[PDB]
Amino acid sequence: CGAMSTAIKKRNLEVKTQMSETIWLEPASERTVFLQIKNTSDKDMSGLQGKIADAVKAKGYQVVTSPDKAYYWIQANVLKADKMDLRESQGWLNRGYEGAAVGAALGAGITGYNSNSAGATLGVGLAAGLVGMAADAMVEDVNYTMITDVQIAERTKATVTTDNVAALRQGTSGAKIQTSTETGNQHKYQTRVVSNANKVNLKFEEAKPVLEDQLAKSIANILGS
Amino acid sequence: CGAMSTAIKKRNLEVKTQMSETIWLEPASERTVFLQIKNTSDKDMSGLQGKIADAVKAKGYQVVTSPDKAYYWIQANVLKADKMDLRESQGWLNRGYEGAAVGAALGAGITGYNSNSAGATLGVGLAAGLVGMAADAMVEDVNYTMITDVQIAERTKATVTTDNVAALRQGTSGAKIQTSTETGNQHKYQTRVVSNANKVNLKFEEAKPVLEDQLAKSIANILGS
Amino acid sequence: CGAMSTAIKKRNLEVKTQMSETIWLEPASERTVFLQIKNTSDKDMSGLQGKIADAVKAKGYQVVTSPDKAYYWIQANVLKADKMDLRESQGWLNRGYEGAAVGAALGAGITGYNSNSAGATLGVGLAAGLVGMAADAMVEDVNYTMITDVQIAERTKATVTTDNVAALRQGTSGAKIQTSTETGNQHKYQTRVVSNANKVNLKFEEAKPVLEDQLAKSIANILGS
Amino acid sequence: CGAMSTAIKKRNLEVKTQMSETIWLEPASERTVFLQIKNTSDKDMSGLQGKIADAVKAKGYQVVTSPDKAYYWIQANVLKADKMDLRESQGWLNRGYEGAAVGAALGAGITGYNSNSAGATLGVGLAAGLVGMAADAMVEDVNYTMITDVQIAERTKATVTTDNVAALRQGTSGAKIQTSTETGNQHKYQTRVVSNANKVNLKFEEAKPVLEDQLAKSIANILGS
Amino acid sequence: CGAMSTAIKKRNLEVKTQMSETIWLEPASERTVFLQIKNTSDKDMSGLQGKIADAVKAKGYQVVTSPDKAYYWIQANVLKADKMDLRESQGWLNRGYEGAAVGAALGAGITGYNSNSAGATLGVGLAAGLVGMAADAMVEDVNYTMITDVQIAERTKATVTTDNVAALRQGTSGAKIQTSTETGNQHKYQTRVVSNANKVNLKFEEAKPVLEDQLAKSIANILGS
Amino acid sequence: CGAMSTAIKKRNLEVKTQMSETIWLEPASERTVFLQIKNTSDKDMSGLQGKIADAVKAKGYQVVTSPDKAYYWIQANVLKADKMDLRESQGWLNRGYEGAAVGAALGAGITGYNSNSAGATLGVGLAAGLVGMAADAMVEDVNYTMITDVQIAERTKATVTTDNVAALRQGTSGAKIQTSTETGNQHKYQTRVVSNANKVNLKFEEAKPVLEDQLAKSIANILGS
Amino acid sequence: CGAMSTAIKKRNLEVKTQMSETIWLEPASERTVFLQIKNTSDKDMSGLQGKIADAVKAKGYQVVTSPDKAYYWIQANVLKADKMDLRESQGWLNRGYEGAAVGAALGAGITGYNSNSAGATLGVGLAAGLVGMAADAMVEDVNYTMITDVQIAERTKATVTTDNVAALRQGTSGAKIQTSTETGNQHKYQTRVVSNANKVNLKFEEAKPVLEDQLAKSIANILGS
Amino acid sequence: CGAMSTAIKKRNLEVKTQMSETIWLEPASERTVFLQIKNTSDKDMSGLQGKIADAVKAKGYQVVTSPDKAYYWIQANVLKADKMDLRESQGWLNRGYEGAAVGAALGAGITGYNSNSAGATLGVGLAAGLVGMAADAMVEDVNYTMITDVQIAERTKATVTTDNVAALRQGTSGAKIQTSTETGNQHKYQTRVVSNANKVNLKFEEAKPVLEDQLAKSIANILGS
Amino acid sequence: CGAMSTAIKKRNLEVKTQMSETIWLEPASERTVFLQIKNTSDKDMSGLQGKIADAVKAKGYQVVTSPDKAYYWIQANVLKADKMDLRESQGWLNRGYEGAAVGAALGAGITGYNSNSAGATLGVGLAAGLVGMAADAMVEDVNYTMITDVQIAERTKATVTTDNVAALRQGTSGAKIQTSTETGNQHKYQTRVVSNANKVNLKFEEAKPVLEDQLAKSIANILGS
């Protein structure tokens, strides 16, 4: 019954996309944008860059290839992707005990009909319980979580000093500290986007296109209009 | 019965809009306002800018298009949007167990009437229990939460130094620290608005207009009169 | 019975108004006051400014329109407003289970009178239980909470330096820090007022006038006499 | 029975007045005092100033009207006032369940006398239970809490530098910091007084005079003799 | 029975007086003492100054009236006074349930004697239970707590700089900081005395003289001999 | 039954690969890459370097052997590898008690058939219980966790100062602190990759190729295109 | 049965070797290595040095005897070794109660066969219970944990200053702080290796060779190739 | 039975010796060692110095008597020694209740044989229970814990400054701080060794020789070879 | 039975002596020692000084009387002594309830023998229960804890500056801070020794000699040989 409740409840693909914080951009008349999209997750999003480009072009911006002559940069990295079962949150009643119980109780459906108390009743009841447990275990409330990192670069007129500071860990004992200083006319801001795709027995190939659509729309809407 | 209680209780769309903190503006005789509204959430709020403009014009302010000649700026970003089920807070009695129980108990309504103990009683009881569980599971106490970031800019006479400081994270190890300094005659303040729309089996298309109305009224009332 | 207890207990509108901290003003012979009242909440408090003006005039102070020639400023912002059900604090026994139980037990009132055990007894009992649950669910112990921010300005003779410091958050990564310095002959102090209006099935239109009265009286009494 | 216990226990008005900390004043031969009493609470304490003046005059001090020629200042503000029910601390056994139970058990008083098991017994028992629940709910153990802030000013011969420092919060983001410096021959000290008035079904009009008496006596006794 | 146990246990007035910390005074041949006793509590301790003077004179010290020519100062302030019921610590078994139970069980004393099962037995039992509950509720284990602040001043030969520092809170936002510096030949030390008076149904008029005696003896014994 | 549920649920090899944080690389026209892969874990991943080289070459980059003339460095170390049983999370119902119980209950399958209550029934039941416990204990839900450290070096034009700081612990008492400074034109960033391979009775030889494939794809995708 | 489950589960020697953190070594053409292996644990690991030397030679490195002419140093210390019983984690069901229970229940195997209720049944049952408890207690799930400290030294060209700082504790009261400074051309890094050997009734002589093999392979693989 | 389980489990002397941290010594050609072993514990370890000397000589080092001409110093102090009962960890079932229960149940062994229900059965049962409780209480799972502090001194060429800092506590109030500075050519490092000897009814005289052997071997192995 | 278990378990005097931390003394050829032993505890340890002197003389050291010509100082203070009952750790089953229960159950020993059910059986049972409770209460598992502070002074050649710093508390308010500086050629170190003497119904006069022996041996062994 729990599997039936899960199947009835989350019978439709539900997709959520949430930005972490807001990046404020001053109004400007420049239109050039340069995109750089990477994917270091096990899942596949090959069309994300194209969808981002289409959404950006829909706002009047012009997408260029050489980063030198672009006023805006959209750097995105699909960093992490995980798949989990929400039914596992309860721990119990998920392995298949309830389905097994229902299947076993189904044996009363054979004690009251046709041959009964003939030994075959126990076998039929055991088979029904096993089938019920298998069916209950094969129903999964799958949720895909995806973490994307976005870095927006905006060209300015004030000199910007970038101070690279890295502390490369070195075997418990210590670390190597690297520091450097550069000067350039470009501001960079970061943000994080979290995506969720929930369904019953969901396969990522079905959730991929709408996930890409929502992520591209959000990242493009960072730019505004 | 729990589903019936939820349906009776939250039978009307309830909308709440709460501002985080107060932004104090000194009295002034200037009227020009420039609006910039963005939406990086999965939900659609397309009429928010128009409603904000109408509410601002209702207060005697004049909305202009070029930010250079505007005394006030209203920068808003509909940052986040989430949908949740309040019935999930209890965890149990929400999957549909209670409705299933009521449906099963309905079988006594067929044991006392017409044919009984004929085997068909068990089938009718099981069907009624399944239908009751399905009906109980299909009743949702949905709540939509919306997070909006507002940034108000007011022109002043004192020189304002903006110190851009960003710490762009770089792979566990370190970060790139960007710093810059600009000078301009403009103060900027921030605030956050949280909106909630609650109803039973609510669809966001119904809650959208009143949500926009309340959000626009609050953001415009920041300006006063 | 719980709904009956709630209805009996909070049968009268109860309104509480509490200031957070005390603002100490030195004795002075000046009388001019300038009011500025804003409302960024979903609730409507339109008469608050007029009531504040009347209460201030009742103390001998004179209300002026131009802030330049006013010795005192009363800046108020009705910031937040929320509505909650106190019965929800128990969680259970609030959905309507107790009323349903009473309604079901009412079926014994039909088993002992007129026709009984005729099948219609179960139907009448179920209808009575449903009606009891509906009646229990429709009784709400509503409490409206209002948060108001007050800022009192008093003109002095010592030069006051205002150091505007703002840290506008910028996308997880960083922030823009704005700093400015002004000099003027005016001190400003803040405070917070919390208002509560409690009743059974209360509508805010009934609680609005007394809420405004108490809030205006408190804010005016800040000035003393 | 619980309501009866509460009524028997707290049948008399109990008033407590507790000062927070001690303000030490050096012995002096000066007698002039200037009073300034304000009330920013919803409760009415109009006679507090007169009672303070009478208590101060009873100690040999002389009350003056112009603060310039007063050696001592007594600045008081009745800041907060709240009303609560102590029976609510238990949560349960307070709504009226126990009174309802007693009223229902009273039905045995009609089963053993006159007509019985006639249907009217159930109605009489239900009416008695309802009346008992209403009576139990209508008994309240009310406690009024009052918070008063006292500021005593004493004239000295050493130059006292007052450094006004205020951090006016500005919309989550930041704050405006106001600083100023003045020089004068006056020390100021603060303290807090907490008053409690407890009774059953107490109305504040009855507890007002003794509350004022105790508060005035404490504030005057700060001065000593 | 619990009330009987409390009455038997704390049948005698028990008074405890505890000093917080020790004030060390160097041996000296000076005898002059100046007393200054104040009372800012709701309780009345009028004879405390006289008892302190008597105890000090019993040690060979001489009490003077003008503070200028006194080597020692004894400044005392009876700051706080509270009254509580120790039986309330258990919460339950204190309202009167146990006495009510005993009174109800007393009805068996009328079922076995004279007329019985005549209806009057229930009435007599109910009256006995009510009387028992009333008697149990009217027995109170009262404890009076008194907090006194003591400040001892001793004249010395080294110059003592007193730095008055006060932070007068100003409405959530900020504070006014007052600082001053004086020079004088006098050291001052503080301490706290806590007094407790415990009895059953105790009235403060009975506990006042012994409380004053113990407090005066302790404060005088600070001086030694 | 629990073992059957585990076998049905995790019947397919599930491999997850998650990067810790994002390493941002500026766009560049350089293609040369130098690989250095080490493995300090007990598991064997010998083909990881070849797969990384193939994936990098698929992106248009050119792999060189001498690190001096390489623009990019990919340094990877398969640091840790652990194997655990997820069924051990429950602690109980995993040792084999449930399988033993089922096997023992199987004895009723021999009491109802053929010879019964002949002593041999107990022996057959005990053997069946032992076999069931053994079968339940031999089903393992194995999960392999692999921790890999990645260090990417990118050649730049700004001088980079590396400050080696190490605190070699010396016997509880103290430490030897080594510090040195070098200058070079190369930035280095770190990151961590976590891999999981889950199955029932999984042998690492089966999970090795897919684990290597996913890890190589992620590390190569760090470079982008 | 628990002992049987443990024996079935961990019937094979399971050995795990995990490095704590990664030591990064720059690519170099030098091959000379100097080994120094010590063992301050109670267990015997005598072949570890030879296995490390063989593994290092298998990578093309050349092992030398004089540390002066060695480019690399491999300093290792087998610091700690502990042996524990995993069955002790449950605390109960481990002493032998379950085996005793099974042995006692075996007495029913003698009540149903041959002589019974003859007194000898109790003796046989007691002997069987004692033997079962002894057998259950004699089955141990032994786990050997080994902690090894590794220190790798690499010759460089930059001057390295070693600051020896030691705080030798001196009897609760204090410490003796020793500080010294040396200069040399050698970097040193540390790391920790944790080894586990798990089996039923395992003797360390069986787990020693594979433990040495894995530890040597890991330490050598630090060097790479 | 619990005593029997303990006796069966820990029937053999188990000795563990664990060093806290590793002391790293640079390779050197010097051989001279000077030993200084002290024992401030209640237990007797007289042969520890001789065993340390033998183990050191077995490594090729030469033991000298005058510390002036020794390159290495081995300073050891057997600081603490404690004896505990592991069975006390359970608290209950250790005093002897279980043995008493078994002894009492043994009375059924006399009710079924020879004379019975003759009064002597109760006496025999009581005596058996007392004997069983005594036997259960006399079985102890004893564990001896020893804490040893080791201080190794190594002669160097760099000047080492020792800063003696001690804070001798002085009666709650304060402390006497002693500081001094010396210069010498010697480094000193510390470490701690923890030894455990576990057995049933173990006497320290049996565990002493192997404890000394393991401790000496570990301390000598600090030096290496 | 619990008292019997305690008496059987701790039937022999068990004495433990544990030093807190190690005091390291450099090797030296000086022999002179000066002892100073004080006892500020309620217990009597009069022979401790003599035993310390004997133990020190047994090591070849020479004890002198004038501290000026002594190379070593042994300053010891037997600071604290406490006596506790370990049986009180359980709280319950210690007052004597179990012994009372056994004594009461002994009444069955008189119901089955001689006269019975004659009223005298109850009296004999009550007397036996009272005697059993008294006997159980009179068995105490006494543990004496002794805390000793040791201060060892060693003469050196480096100048040692002692900075006396004391913060004498002055009545809650403040403190008097005393500071002084002296110079001398002597180092001082501290340590703490904890002694425990455990037995059933132990009297300190029996545990005194062995306590002194162990404490003296430990303090003397601080010096070594």
Numbering used by the authors:
A (entry chain J), B (entry chain A), C (entry chain B), D (entry chain C), E (entry chain D), F (entry chain I), ...: 1 to 225
Task: Share the article's original sentences.
TraT is a highly expressed ~24 kDa lipoprotein with a copy number of approximately 29,000–84,000 copies/cell. In this work, we determined the cryo-EM structure of TraT encoded by pKpQIL (TraTpKpQIL) and the F (TraTF) plasmid derivative, pOX38, at 2.47 Å and 2.66 Å resolution respectively.
To study the structural basis of SFX specificity, the structure of TraTF was also determined. The cryo-EM structure has an overall resolution of 2.66 Å (Fourier shell correlation (FSC) = 0.143 criterion; Fig. 5a, Supplementary Fig. 4 and Supplementary Table 1). Like TraTpKpQIL, TraTF consists of ten identical protomers that form a transmembrane α-helical barrel domain and an extracellular ring-like domain. The TraTF monomer comprises the same secondary structure elements as shown for TraTpKpQIL and exhibits a similar conformation. TraTpKpQIL and TraTF can be superimposed with an rmsd of 0.523 Å over 225 Cα atoms. The conjugation frequency of pKpQIL into ICC8001-pBAD-traTF and ICC8001-pBAD-empty recipients did not display significant differences, suggesting that TraTF cannot exclude pKpQIL. It is likely that specificity is driven by either the α2 or/and β-hairpin motif as the amino acids display low conservation.
